[PDB]
Amino acid sequence: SSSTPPRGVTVVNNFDCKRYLGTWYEIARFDHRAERGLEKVTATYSLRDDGGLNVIFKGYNPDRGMWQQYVGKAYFTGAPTRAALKVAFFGPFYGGYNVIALDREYRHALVCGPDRDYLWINSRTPTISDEVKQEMLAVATREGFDVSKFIWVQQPGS
């Protein structure tokens, strides 16, 4: 089931959706065809009339010589105080989106998909401290993700 969280993963359960809105830089990702080779990736989150979120993915594609966007819609699968969502880019075809770690300042987030082949480190800044990087890798490995799969995404100052 590609719209539920991975078995045996803790999801953030005191989620304040309003503080999560705005722009997040992608620090690291497990690669798949949608993202592979994209640089300087951000995700931008905004509230919709219908209680879902707009998710605008932006990345630089060196082979095409262009910036490209993916326009999606995210909805909470349960209460909006549990950071368990599902995202679609076309039609009723959803993937799981789960915030599994978040600092009290809503400045750094570990986000996974519906299984352990999907994981992202995200930051309000394009670079993170070695201390924040270490905590992210510790949380991910404790939840059973193979962090050797990370691609460290090209960002200004990386």
Provide CATH code, domain 17-152: 2.40.128.20
Contact (CB, 8 A) for 77 and 86: yes
Count CA atoms within 13 Å of residue 55 on its CB side.
20
Question: At how many Å resolution was this determined?
Answer: 1.9
For 26, residues 6+ apart whose C-beta sits below 8 A from its C-beta are 41, 42, 43, 120, 121, 122, 153, 155
| Cα–Cα distances in angstroms (integers) from residue 79 to residues 21, 53, 76, in the given order | 17, 14, 7
Separation of alpha carbons 94 and 32, rounded Å? 16
Question: Which residue is associated with the tokens 């939840």?
Answer: 143
Residue 19: φ, ψ to 5°: -75, -15
Contact (CB, 8 A) for 153 and 127: no
